[PDB]
């Protein structure tokens, strides 16, 4: 079950300055980037074109290129329409893409946030506000929904293009997606012990402090933190009495280890 996310971040500081940057994720692996500085979308994997021919890619890129320039003018123009009520600076975020299920099934989505709050989505054949959205957005929605050609294009993007493209990506990027990277662990202290686990992929991992073969239930795992090389980092801590560290061990289970767990005794 993989989620494909196209993420757009647009900042408008005033009437005459904006930037738009995008990144694209398939699960927890980046497949594209698109800087404001670049006229073209950059592949961050060798398989980022998926199963699209070069002609299909160019057509798709070209639609995005037009979108980015148009989007920019449209926001600026919507701001003129609502003022003095709404005004700069403005942050807009888009999250679009699809979630792939087994056997030709998928749900596509297009969610828009305004100043950090989810306010609008594309649903069915039109834009709509979601619950909690301020009512002044009804005018922008009404204007956006007037554009029949954008609607038809977005519909085709969500319904047909996203799932097709992503099915091809899963095939082309199989060996990067199904990779197995081993965690390396190490210990340290500050009383509070720390078991550092780093270098593992995929994300599912089990880490627990133990005496012999007894799970120490005071174990607090922290967040999953990324490494620069597309592997993960996690630290599992444990509060203990000074002097009472004899026979404590850190056990780590991960799919890459193939049964041979890592056990580190203090």
């Amino acid at each position, epitope marked *: 079950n993989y989620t494909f996310r196209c993420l757009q971040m647009s900042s408008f500081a005033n009437r005459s300055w904006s930037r738009t940057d995008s990144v694209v994720w398939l699960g927890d692996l980046q497949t594209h980037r698109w800087s404001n500085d670049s006229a073209t979308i950059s592949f961050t994997k060798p398989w980022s074109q998926g199963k699209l021919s070069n002609q299909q890619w160019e057509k798709l890129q070209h639609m995005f290129q037009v979108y980015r*320039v*148009s989007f920019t003018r449209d926001i600026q123009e919507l701001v003129k329409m609502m003022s003095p009520k709404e005004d700069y600076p403005i942050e807009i975020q888009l999250s679009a893409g699809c979630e792939m299920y087994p056997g030709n099934a998928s749900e596509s989505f297009l969610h828009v946030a305004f100043q950090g709050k989810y306010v609008v989505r594309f649903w069915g054949t039109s834009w709509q506000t979601v619950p909690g959205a301020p009512s002044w957005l009804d005018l922008p929605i009404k204007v956006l929904n*007037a*554009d029949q*050609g954008t609607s038809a294009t977005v519909q085709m993007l969500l319904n047909d293009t996203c799932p097709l493209f992503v099915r091809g990506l899963l095939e082309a990027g199989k060996s990067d997606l199904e990779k197995q990277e081993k965690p390396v662990a190490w210990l340290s202290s500050v009383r509070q012990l720390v078991c550092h686990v780093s270098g593992f992929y995929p994300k599912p991992v089990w880490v627990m402090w133990m005496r012999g073969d007894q799970e120490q239930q005071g174990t607090h795992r922290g967040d999953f933190l990324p490494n620069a090389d597309e592997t993960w980092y996690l630290q599992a801590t444990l509060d203990v009495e000074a002097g009472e560290e004899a026979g404590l061990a850190c056990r780590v289970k991960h799919s890459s280890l193939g049964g041979q767990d890592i056990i580190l005794y203090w």
Partner: T-cell receptor
Amino acid sequence: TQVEQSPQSLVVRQGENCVLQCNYSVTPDNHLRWFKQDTGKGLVSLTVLVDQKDKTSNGRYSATLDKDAKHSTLHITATLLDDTATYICVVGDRGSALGRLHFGAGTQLIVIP
Amino acid sequence: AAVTQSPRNKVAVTGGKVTLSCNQTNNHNNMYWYRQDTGHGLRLIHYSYGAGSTEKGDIPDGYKASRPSQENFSLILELATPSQTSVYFCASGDEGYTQYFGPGTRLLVLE
């Protein structure tokens, strides 16, 4: 100037057909409208073309649009004296009020009766 | 959807004040002022998304705009010059792309 019209002017005799060209560089190109303007008068819409490869008709006027080539033609069949006017091509860059219109400078037609 | 313009025709002196008015009873939020000059297509001067709003178009220099109400959109030339001799068209529209044009206003600015 992102909208260009050819010919700039032409003279034809009553009953003859003629073809008026519009070429543009406007991006994006949601739709194209053809206007008729009599001398001293205002803008009367003749037709609006919206599809990638579109065709329209309105009596003796017919038109085509190809968005790949960014090209439109207005055909007037069997000209009459009252077709003496300037014909104007307009490209709209959005399917909403957020669009700007990009106007050609027009083609002057004279029909000799 | 009908739009009206007044005056329809106007002779003015350099340095004088000229006001061109446009009235529209369609309840359209959006209004637009253009000028037409030989060898050019219509060019946008000012526009408005509603009462109190005015926006600069492509060639706003020498013109002030005014949107006192939904119905009325005015083009004000405070210090009229001969370069403002032209035919001025007003238009209105709702959220759709169609603009509905008024019949035009001839302006001559004499020295």
